[PDB]
Design a protein around this ligand. Structure first.
Ligand SMILES: [Mg+2]
Ligand SMILES: [Mg+2]
Ligand SMILES: [Mg+2]
Ligand SMILES: [Mg+2]
Ligand SMILES: [Mg+2]
Ligand SMILES: [Mg+2]
Ligand SMILES: [Mg+2]
Ligand SMILES: [Mg+2]
Ligand SMILES: [Mg+2]
Ligand SMILES: [Mg+2]
Ligand SMILES: [Mg+2]
Ligand SMILES: [Mg+2]
Ligand SMILES: [Mg+2]
Ligand SMILES: [Mg+2]
Ligand SMILES: [Mg+2]
Ligand SMILES: [Mg+2]
Ligand SMILES: [Mg+2]
Ligand SMILES: [Mg+2]
Ligand SMILES: [Mg+2]
Ligand SMILES: [Mg+2]
Ligand SMILES: [Mg+2]
Ligand SMILES: [Mg+2]
Ligand SMILES: [Mg+2]
Ligand SMILES: [Mg+2]
Ligand SMILES: [Zn+2]
Lengths: 49, 71, 111
RNA sequence: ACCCACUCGGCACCUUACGAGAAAUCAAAGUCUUUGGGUUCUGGGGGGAGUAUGGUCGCAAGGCUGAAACUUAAAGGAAUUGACGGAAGGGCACCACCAGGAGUGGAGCCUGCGGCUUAAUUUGACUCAACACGGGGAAACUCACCAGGUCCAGACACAAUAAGGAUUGACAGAUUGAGAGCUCUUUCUUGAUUUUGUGGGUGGUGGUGCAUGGCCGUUCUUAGUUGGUGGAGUGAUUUGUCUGCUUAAUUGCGAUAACGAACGAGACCUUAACCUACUAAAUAGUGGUGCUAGCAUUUGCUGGUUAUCCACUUCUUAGAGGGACUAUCGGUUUCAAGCCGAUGGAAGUUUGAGGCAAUAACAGGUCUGUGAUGCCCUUAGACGUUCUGGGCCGCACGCGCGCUACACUGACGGAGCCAGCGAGUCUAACCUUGGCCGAGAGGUCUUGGUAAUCUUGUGAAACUCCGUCGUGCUGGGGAUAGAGCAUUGUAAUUAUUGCUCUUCAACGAGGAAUUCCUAGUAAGCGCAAGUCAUCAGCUUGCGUUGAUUACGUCCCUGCCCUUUGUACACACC
């Protein structure tokens, strides 16, 4: 247990010393409802009698 | 605890009937279509919706209840 | 279970702590509850230097059979304190004297 | 007869350990893997069992001899550390006593607990360490209980239904506590969001605190815990860590096969005491001065005046420092740690009071704080959830915490009139001055304050002063009850609270018992905060007035330590 526990602190030093040195999609949303706001998009008529 | 009692008669819910309903319209011979069941004057109801025929009653269901119109 | 906590203490200590204490409380694999202190080095438990020098965390780890408490204690080295007191109120240091070469009958200097 | 020296041969003790042993120990239990002086006897895991059987002896009881089948992984020895004792020796303490104080126990009501009652009267907890505890003062809510009524807020997958409609809603009526389309009547509306079925989730103040985390209580008003180098032992271990002495303290002195340290106590931190020294202040305050009122007048005395100016920091505030270290001296003592007395000092009981607090233990409490949680239970005629009403308050009565009294060191009526800890309203209705009106409770028009700025100098209460009553259940006492007026709130009936009138109970100092307490303490006295729409007889803090009696001990009770016994170690449950 203790020997494998020690080697764990050895792997936690590896990662620690290593990382200390180591090694667009536009058109939005509210703009796309305004760009598609060019309409021809509806229909209305009703209401007689 | 205790677990149950029940002097019987458990409650039911509702069926939304069946009703092949909209035959209620009429077409003379080729093709004039005369509506039946007068429609509703609420600007919320676009004259497609109709009224229900009871005693004293013509009733808009498109208004979930609203506005008793009586003829 | 010991591999974990004994490693944690060995990383905490090799990180330059003054001392460390780790407690796992709960149920692992048995029906009954147990607890284990895991300690190395130096911790102080009393008074104000507590708030200064030891950093305590408890955590609930939720496992298939039940829930364990994790309890960690780190004593940071008061020598490195930066902003704060630099030792425990116990610490009394005596500055060491000088070996003297006396005698040399009086005379005087002049400038 | 004695004394002294020697010598045989005895009964033993003492110290040694070369030596032996698993140790305890042992001049043999030594001269033993470096194994051989002579000889007799007995044992070969435990139980079966000293049983059966045969023989033999005996009057007999029984004695000597003495198996096996079967069963079984231990039984056993010495030593160690724990734990426990209805063994002994030391201690500590107003949750112990001493000397006393104020009481509780008696009465009335307040309140929790039991019990009974109940549709339900939700529930946890039962010696200190359950019972004004769950911050638990519940009218709705809370709420878990009871009588009933809706709702899905049933994620997701597949499947079934089905655009000729999978599904939703509803006016009026009937119905319902109900202006719930709950359901029903009738016939509109809705558009793939649901429905139905399985599988899987989900919620639950449902169960399990004896499955857990966490937190808390208790042991503990305690003084204990460990490791380095050395010493003892094959070893677990021990010594250090101890007779005594001292301390609140494993706090120290001292003794010392130990030396020298660490955790815990201490240190530390917070608060109350002291700073005419430091830095300042119209959100604190003083003096001078104007402007100014009253009384006197010889100048005087007593006030008004958020800036009309000047100066100050004693008072108030809080920054930085200072200060005490039981100092000085003297008694007392291993002249050691310390103790005691006196002087000085703001302060000398750990300065006073708190915060923090090692290792360990308990099937202590808490799933009813938690969207912390395992498992179990339930999941649509719900133990989910909401809505209406009731219930936790129900009263032959047992227990406990309390409040008010039994009066004259007093009630009452005038009158003097003095604190400290607090807290207060934004996307809102909190703390309230002042002016009116009202007997009061209150109402009402305005007002300052997000605050050392306004409430508020919180003009509190006990208390002081002058009267009235005069020992008579009296004008002490205020339960019970009637009648009316107000406030909070959607709601006040089982009476939320407040006022007025009337009604005028018990209780004439409390049995056995038993709690709490050593100085600004006890006790008497109110206040603010918590809770809070309204409700304190509770609690957490606060100041006011302010004693008597110890300054000791182990008798009682309680626990801590040694020694000792142990066949316990899941540790006397
Ligand atoms: Mg301390
Ligand atoms: Mg007594
Ligand atoms: Mg008495
Ligand atoms: Mg239970
Ligand atoms: Mg209800
Ligand atoms: Mg419906
Ligand atoms: Mg299921
Ligand atoms: Mg299931
Ligand atoms: Mg428990
Ligand atoms: Mg005491
Ligand atoms: Mg010493
Ligand atoms: Mg310490
Ligand atoms: Mg000053
Ligand atoms: Mg003096
Ligand atoms: Mg239990
Ligand atoms: Mg549960
Ligand atoms: Mg109750
Ligand atoms: Mg009076
Ligand atoms: Mg009378
Ligand atoms: Mg009276
Ligand atoms: Mg309020
Ligand atoms: Mg209050
Ligand atoms: Mg309470
Ligand atoms: Mg023993
Ligand atoms: Zn309509």
């Amino acid at each position: 247990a203790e020997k494998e526990a020690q080697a764990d602190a050895a792997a936690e030093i590896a990662e620690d010393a290593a990382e200390a040195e180591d090694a667009x999609x536009x058109x939005x949303x509210x703009x796309x409802x305004x760009x598609x706001x060019x309409x021809x998009x509806x229909x209305x008529x009703x209401x007689x009698x | 605890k205790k677990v149950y009692t029940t002097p019987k008669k458990i409650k039911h819910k509702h069926k939304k009937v069946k009703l092949a309903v909209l035959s209620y319209y009429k077409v003379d011979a080729e093709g004039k279509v005369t509506k039946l069941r007068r429609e509703c004057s609420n600007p919320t109801c676009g004259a497609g919706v109709f009224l229900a025929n009871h005693k004293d009653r013509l009733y808009c269901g498109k208004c979930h209840s609203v506005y008793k119109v009586n003829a | 279970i010991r591999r974990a906590a004994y490693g944690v203490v060995r990383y905490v200590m090799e990180s330059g702590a003054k001392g460390c204490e780790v407690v796992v409380s709960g149920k692992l694999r048995a029906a009954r509850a147990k607890a284990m202190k895991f300690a190395d080095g130096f911790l102080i438990h009393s008074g104000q230097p507590v708030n200064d020098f030891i950093d305590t965390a408890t955590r609930h780890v939720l496992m298939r059979q039940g829930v364990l408490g994790i309890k960690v204690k780190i004593m940071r080295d008061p020598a490195k304190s930066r902003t704060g007191p630099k030792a425990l109120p116990d610490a009394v240091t005596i500055i060491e004297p000088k070996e003297e070469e006396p005698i040399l009958a009086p005379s005087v200097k002049d400038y």
